[PDB]
Amino acid sequence: IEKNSGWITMEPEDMWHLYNILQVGDQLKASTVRRILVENMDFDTKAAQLHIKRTTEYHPMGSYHTLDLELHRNFTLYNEWDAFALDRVDAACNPSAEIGAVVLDEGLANICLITDYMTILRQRIDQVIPRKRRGDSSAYQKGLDKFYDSVFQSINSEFDFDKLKVVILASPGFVARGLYDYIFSMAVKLDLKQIVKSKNKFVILHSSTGHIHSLNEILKDPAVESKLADTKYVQEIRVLNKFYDVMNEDDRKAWYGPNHVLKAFELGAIGELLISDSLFRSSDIATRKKWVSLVEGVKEINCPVYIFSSLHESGKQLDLLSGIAAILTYPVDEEDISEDE
Amino acid sequence: KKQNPTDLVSVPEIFEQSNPKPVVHLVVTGHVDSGKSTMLGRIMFELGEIIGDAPGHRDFISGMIAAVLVVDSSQNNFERGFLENGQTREHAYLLRALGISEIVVSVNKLDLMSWSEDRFQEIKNIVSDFLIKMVGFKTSNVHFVPISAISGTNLIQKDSSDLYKWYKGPTLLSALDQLVPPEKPYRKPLRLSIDDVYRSPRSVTVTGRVEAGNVQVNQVLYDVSSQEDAYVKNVIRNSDPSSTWAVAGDTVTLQLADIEVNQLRPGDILSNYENPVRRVRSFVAEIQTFDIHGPILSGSTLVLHLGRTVTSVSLKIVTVNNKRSRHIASRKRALVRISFLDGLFPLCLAEECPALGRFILRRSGDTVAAGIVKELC
C-alpha cells in the first residue's frame, strides 16, 4: 500500500481512529447520496456518525459535498503519512473489551460506556430532589424513587450486558449500594435475563462526586485493578498520577505545557515521561510536524510516550494542562512563558 | 419567542417605618475551654436583665462555620505554650480565605491571672503573630478585648474590677458596635438564593434566603438560569406570619405562579430584570490554600461548593504570592481564573454579596482552598 506518499483502503472506535487519521488537504471517497478534498471532520461523540466535508473528481466538480461515513463498508484515503498518522492507521485495525460505568450522586447520574480509546456519555440524569422536611419526607422520597427508576431505565437501554466485562456503580454516599439492590430487584420482578446473568460483573465503588471527572478516581481503584489494569484508560490514569507523584516530590522534575516540554527536550530532561495528547491534530502543518518530531525524538531514545485520547477524562485533564506534560530524569530550574490565553 | 411580565403597581419596601437596626453577622470560634460558650450565655443573661441572638443598639445574629460579616476568636489563660494549637487555627485561616477582614479577640479569664496587664500583652502577641504574621490580617482589623465570661467587660465597664485600673478600651459589646456592617442591603438589587424547590397546589414552592434587596407579594421574580420568570403568590418571611414582603437577611418560603417546577433548581439566584444577576462561564478569584497533598496545577479540575451548587471547575493560575507560578502549594494566596465545566452558573462578587461570592474548592474528597469572587467574565 505504502511506497515513498500513497493511499490506504479500509467497530465504533474505528470512526475515532479515523477522526485522528483524517487531515485537511486529504482526499477520500465511498458511497453517498446526491473523492473530496477533506475540509471538515465532525465526530458525533454518541457515536454512530463521522461527517467529512469539495468534489475533486469526475461528475456525471467545485461544489461542496459531505460524506457521512458508514462503519463496515469501506473508503479510500489520500501524500505525507506522518509517524503518528501511521501508528493509528495501523492500530485498530488490527484490534484486540468494553466497560459500563455509572457515576452518581443523589439526583445525579452519568452513564458511561468505556473502551480503550473512548469514554462516551450515554445519559446524564439530573433531577431535583426536594429536601427532607423535618415533619415530612414525601417529596424527597418520591423524588428519590423517580431517580432510581430513571437510571435503571437508562442503563437498561444503554448497556448490552453480554458485551461489557464490568459495569461499575460509584457514588459518594449510599446511592450506588441502593441502586445495585434496586436494579436486581426490578430485574427479577420483571423478567430481565440480561441483567440477572450479569450480577457477577457489577462492582460497587466509592467516589468523591457523581461528576464525570470522578472517573479518574476509579478506574484506578484497587477493587477493580484485577480486571482492568491491562487497559489503555487505566494506563493513562497511572501515568497521569505517576506524573502527579513526581510533581509532589519535586516540582523541578515535572513539567507541562508546549514551550516547557520543548525546552525540556532541548536539554536531556525527558525520560519515561511523554504525556502527550491526541488533540495535537491541528491543520497548521508547520505545527503538526514538531509534535511528530518530539514523539519520534523520545521514541528513538528508549523513553515511553503516552498519547492520551482526548475523549477519556484522563485525556481531558491532560488537555486542561496544555496537552503535553513530562516527568524529568533530573531536577531542572527555569522560567518559560507558555503561549496561550 | 418569550414575553416578559411586567410588574404591577405596588408598594415600596417599608421596613424603615418600624425603626430597624442593622443585623450584623458573626461567627464565633475558639477552643471548648476558652469560655466561648459561657461568654455567649453571659451576654444572653445580662441582656436578659434590662440560633443565638443578642441585641444592643445593633443586632447580632451569631452563627457557625466549619457567609457572615465579622468574627471573633476567644481564648483562655493557662500554661500557654502548646495551645495555641487546636483547629481554631484552621478556622482563622478559613475566615481569611473567605471574605472576613475584621476579628475581635476575646481574651477570656484574666480574672484568673489577677487581671495582669503583662499577661494580656503576652497573649496579644502570641495571637497577633498568628493572626497577623502567619495569616493575612491587618493589625488595625484585629481588636483585642479583655473579658471574664463569668461576668466581665462584655456589656458594662460598670465593674470596679482591677482591670479598669489599666484598661481604657471599650467593652466587647462596644467593640462589636464599632464594626461597620454593609450599608443598607434591603435597598441593593434583589438577590434571592434557592435552597429547595418543590411542587404545590397552584404554585411551585421555593425556599431560601434574601441575600440582598427585597421582595413582596405579587411581584415578578426573574431566574437567569432557566431564562424564565414568575409571579410571587405568597411570602412567608421568617416565622410564619401573614407577612407580605421580606428584606435582605430573611429566610423566605415563596410561592411562584406562572413557572413550571423543572425550570427552577436549588443554587439558582433570582432577581428582578432590573440589575439582573449575571450567569457566567468563568470568573476571577482570590483563593487561599490550606494543607494540601499534591499542589494545584494550572488546569486542574476541582469541585466548587457555593450554595446548594457544587460543580466541576478548572482552575487556571494568574499569580501566587504575587509572583507568576506553575503550581500552587500549601498555605498560599493566589489570584486565579476558575471556569465551570458544566455550563453557565449565576453568581456575584463577594463585594456585592458574601453568601454568593464565597466558595470552597475540593479535589477528590479533600478540601484544598477557599476564596472570594473578584470579577465576572
The number of angstroms, rounded, from the C-alpha of A338 to the middle of its chain's C-alpha atoms is 26
Q: Which of B253, B275, B297 is the last residue of a domain?
A: B275
Dist. CA A98–CA A103, nearest whole Å? 16
Residues with Cβ within 8 Å of A333's Cβ and at least 6 positions away in sequence, in order, are A252
Phi, psi for residue A216 in degrees, rounded to 5:
-75, -20
The 8 Å CB, 24+ separation contacts for A174-181 are: A175/A104, A175/A105, A175/A106, A175/A210, A176/A102, A176/A104, A176/A204, A176/A205, A176/A207, A177/A204, A178/A148, A179/A102, A179/A104, A179/A148, A179/A151, A179/A152, A180/A204
Dist. CA A161–CA B184, nearest whole Å? 61
Question: Residue B252 has which C-alpha cell?
Answer: 423566605
Dist. CA A320–CA B312, nearest whole Å? 13
Contacting A residues, span 193-252, partner chain B, CB-CB under 8 Å: 208-209, 211-213, 217, 244-245, 247-248, 251
Dist. CA B31–CA B155, nearest whole Å? 22
CATH number at residue A48: 2.30.30.870
Residues with Cβ within 8 Å of B68's Cβ and at least 6 positions away in sequence, in order, are B25, B26, B27, B100, B354
Residues with Cβ within 8 Å of B178's Cβ and at least 6 positions away in sequence, in order, are B143, B170
CB < 8 Å to A131, chain B: 195-196
Dist. CA A140–CA A143, nearest whole Å? 5
Give how many domains chain A has, as a whole number: 3
Dist. CA B305–CA A199, nearest whole Å? 36
CB < 8 Å to A320, chain B: 299-301, 314
The number of angstroms, rounded, from the C-alpha of B374 to the middle of its chain's C-alpha atoms is 16
- Record: contact B293-A248, CB cut-off 8 A: yes
For every residue of B111-122, DSSP letters joined together read GGGTT-HHHHHH
The number of angstroms, rounded, from the C-alpha of A141 to the middle of its chain's C-alpha atoms is 36
Kindly state whether residues A88 and A168 are assigned to the same domain. Answer: no
Kindly state whether residues B146 and B254 are assigned to the same domain. Answer: no
Dist. CA B259–CA B12, nearest whole Å? 24
DSSP letter at B226 equals T
For every residue of A98-126, DSSP letters joined together read -EEEEEEETTEEEEEEE-SS-EEEEEEEE
Do the Cβ atoms of B75 and B31 come closer than 8 Å? yes
Contacting B residues, span 327-366, partner chain A, CB-CB under 8 Å: 327, 341-342, 362, 364-365
Kindly state whether residues B158 and B69 are assigned to the same domain. Answer: yes
Nearest Cα to Cα of residue B22 among B355, B252, B247: B247
Do the Cβ atoms of A213 and A96 come closer than 8 Å? no
Residues with Cβ within 8 Å of A37's Cβ and at least 6 positions away in sequence, in order, are A25, A26, A27, A54, A56
Kindly state whether residues A188 and A261 are assigned to the same domain. Answer: no
Kindly state whether residues A81 and A106 are assigned to the same domain. Answer: no
Question: Residue B153 has which C-alpha cell?
Answer: 467587660
Dist. CA A113–CA A90, nearest whole Å? 24
Kindly state whether residues B51 and B139 are assigned to the same domain. Answer: yes
Q: Say if residue B180 carries a ligand binding annotation.
A: no
Q: Which of B180, B199, B226 is the last residue of a domain?
A: B180
Kindly state whether residues A47 and A166 are assigned to the same domain. Answer: no
Do the Cβ atoms of A224 and A205 come closer than 8 Å? yes
Nearest Cα to Cα of residue B270 among B279, B258, B260: B279
CB < 8 Å to B336, chain A: none
Question: Residue B213 has which C-alpha cell?
Answer: 434587596
CATH number at residue B365: 2.40.30.10
Kindly state whether residues A82 and A106 are assigned to the same domain. Answer: no
Kindly state whether residues A101 and A225 are assigned to the same domain. Answer: yes
Give the experimental resolution in Å. Answer: 2.7
CATH number at residue A294: 3.30.1330.30
- Record: contact A248-B314, CB cut-off 8 A: no
For this PDB entry, the determination method is X-ray
Nearest Cα of chain B lies from the Cα of A335 at a distance, in angstroms, of: 9
Q: Sign of the CA dihedral B328, B330, B334, B338?
A: positive
Residues forming a β-bridge with A50: A43
Residues with Cβ within 8 Å of B99's Cβ and at least 6 positions away in sequence, in order, are B67, B350, B354, B357, B358, B372
**Residue A60: is it exposed, middle or buried by C-beta count within 10 angstroms (0-12/13-18/19+)?**
exposed
Do the Cβ atoms of B180 and B232 come closer than 8 Å? no
Kindly state whether residues A155 and A238 are assigned to the same domain. Answer: no
Extended strands (E) in B275-319 = 278-280, 282-289, 296-297, 300-305, 310-319
Kindly state whether residues A197 and A235 are assigned to the same domain. Answer: no
CB < 8 Å to A334, chain B: none
Kindly state whether residues B152 and B217 are assigned to the same domain. Answer: no
- Record: contact A256-B297, CB cut-off 8 A: yes
Q: Which of A198, A229, A260 is the last residue of a domain?
A: A229
Do the Cβ atoms of A291 and A322 come closer than 8 Å? no
Domain that holds residue A177: 97-229
DSSP letter at A7 equals -
- Record: contact A130-B196, CB cut-off 8 A: yes
DSSP letter at A131 equals P
Do the Cβ atoms of B205 and B187 come closer than 8 Å? no
Give how many domains chain B has, as a whole number: 3
Q: Which of B275, B310, B337 is the last residue of a domain?
A: B275
Kindly state whether residues B262 and B339 are assigned to the same domain. Answer: no
DSSP letter at A29 equals B
Do the Cβ atoms of B108 and B144 come closer than 8 Å? no
Extended strands (E) in B43-190 = 53-55, 59-63, 70-75, 103-108, 142-147
B249 touches chain A (CB under 8 A): no
Q: Is B48 helix (H, G, I), strand (E, B) or coil?
A: helix
Do the Cβ atoms of A91 and A17 come closer than 8 Å? yes
Question: Residue B232 has which C-alpha cell?
Answer: 410571587
Kindly state whether residues A183 and A235 are assigned to the same domain. Answer: no
Q: What distances in angstroms separate CA A156 from CA A46, A123, A144, A184, B143, one per listed residue?
A: 17, 11, 18, 11, 63
Kindly state whether residues A157 and A253 are assigned to the same domain. Answer: no
Residues with Cβ within 8 Å of A140's Cβ and at least 6 positions away in sequence, in order, are A129, A130, A131, A132, A133
CB < 8 Å to A139, chain B: 198-199
Dist. CA B371–CA B365, nearest whole Å? 18
B292 touches chain A (CB under 8 A): no
Domain that holds residue B350: 276-377
**What is the number of other CB atoms lying within 10 angstroms of the CB of residue B369?**
25
A68: phi > 0 → left, psi -120 to 50 → alpha, else beta; which? left
- Record: contact A131-B265, CB cut-off 8 A: no
Whether the bond between B84 and the residue before it is cis, its omega within 30 degrees of 0, is: yes
Kindly state whether residues B64 and B119 are assigned to the same domain. Answer: yes
**What is the number of other CB atoms lying within 10 angstroms of the CB of residue A120?**
16
Dist. CA B214–CA B327, nearest whole Å? 43
CB < 8 Å to A217, chain B: 364
Residues with Cβ within 8 Å of B134's Cβ and at least 6 positions away in sequence, in order, are none
Dist. CA B46–CA B155, nearest whole Å? 8
Dist. CA B32–CA B149, nearest whole Å? 13
Dist. CA B3–CA B302, nearest whole Å? 38
For every residue of B327-367, DSSP letters joined together read EE-SS-EEEEEEEESSS-EEE--TTT-HHHHEEEEESSSSE
Residues forming a β-bridge with B321: none
Dist. CA B352–CA A47, nearest whole Å? 45
CATH number at residue A134: 3.30.420.60
Residue A153, amino acid: Q
Q: What distances in angstroms separate CA B106 from CA A21, B80, B152, B298, one per listed residue?
A: 69, 16, 11, 40
Nearest Cα to Cα of residue A67 among A18, A17, A106: A18
Q: What distances in angstroms separate CA A279 from CA A87, A236, A318, B186, one per listed residue?
A: 15, 15, 10, 50
Kindly state whether residues B39 and B169 are assigned to the same domain. Answer: yes
- Record: contact B295-A247, CB cut-off 8 A: yes
The number of angstroms, rounded, from the C-alpha of B31 to the middle of its chain's C-alpha atoms is 21
Dist. CA B124–CA B131, nearest whole Å? 10
Residues with Cβ within 8 Å of B322's Cβ and at least 6 positions away in sequence, in order, are none
What's the count of helices (H) and strands (E) in chain B, helices before strands? 5, 24
B160 touches chain A (CB under 8 A): no
Question: Residue A86 has which C-alpha cell?
Answer: 501511521
Residues forming a β-bridge with B107: B75, B146
Dist. CA A10–CA A21, nearest whole Å? 12
**Residue B243: is it exposed, middle or buried by C-beta count within 10 angstroms (0-12/13-18/19+)?**
middle
Q: Which of A96, A124, A140 is the last residue of a domain?
A: A96
Residue B196, amino acid: D
Q: Is B283 helix (H, G, I), strand (E, B) or coil?
A: strand
CATH number at residue B38: 3.40.50.300
Q: How far apart are the first and last CA of chain B?
A: 27
Kindly state whether residues B175 and B185 are assigned to the same domain. Answer: no
Q: Which of A77, A96, A115 is the last residue of a domain?
A: A96
B293 touches chain A (CB under 8 A): yes
Kindly state whether residues B57 and B130 are assigned to the same domain. Answer: yes
Question: Residue B268 has which C-alpha cell?
Answer: 439558582
The CA-CA-CA angle for residues A169, A173, A177, to 5°, reads 45
DSSP letter at B200 equals E
**Residue A1: is it exposed, middle or buried by C-beta count within 10 angstroms (0-12/13-18/19+)?**
exposed
Residue A313, amino acid: E
Dist. CA B308–CA B195, nearest whole Å? 6
Q: Number of C-alpha atoms within 13 angstroms, CB side, residue A308? A: 30
Question: Residue B227 has which C-alpha cell?
Answer: 431564562
Question: Residue A285 has which C-alpha cell?
Answer: 502543518
The CA-CA-CA angle for residues B202, B208, B211, to 5°, reads 130
The number of angstroms, rounded, from the C-alpha of A302 to the middle of its chain's C-alpha atoms is 26
Nearest Cα to Cα of residue A14 among A120, A103, A111, A90: A90
- Record: contact B300-A208, CB cut-off 8 A: no
Kindly state whether residues A164 and A185 are assigned to the same domain. Answer: yes
- Record: contact A213-B300, CB cut-off 8 A: no
**Residue A40: is it exposed, middle or buried by C-beta count within 10 angstroms (0-12/13-18/19+)?**
exposed
Residues with Cβ within 8 Å of A100's Cβ and at least 6 positions away in sequence, in order, are A111, A112, A113, A114, A155, A158, A159, A161, A164, A166, A167, A168
Do the Cβ atoms of B361 and B368 come closer than 8 Å? yes
Kindly state whether residues B132 and B38 are assigned to the same domain. Answer: yes
Question: Residue B23 has which C-alpha cell?
Answer: 443585623
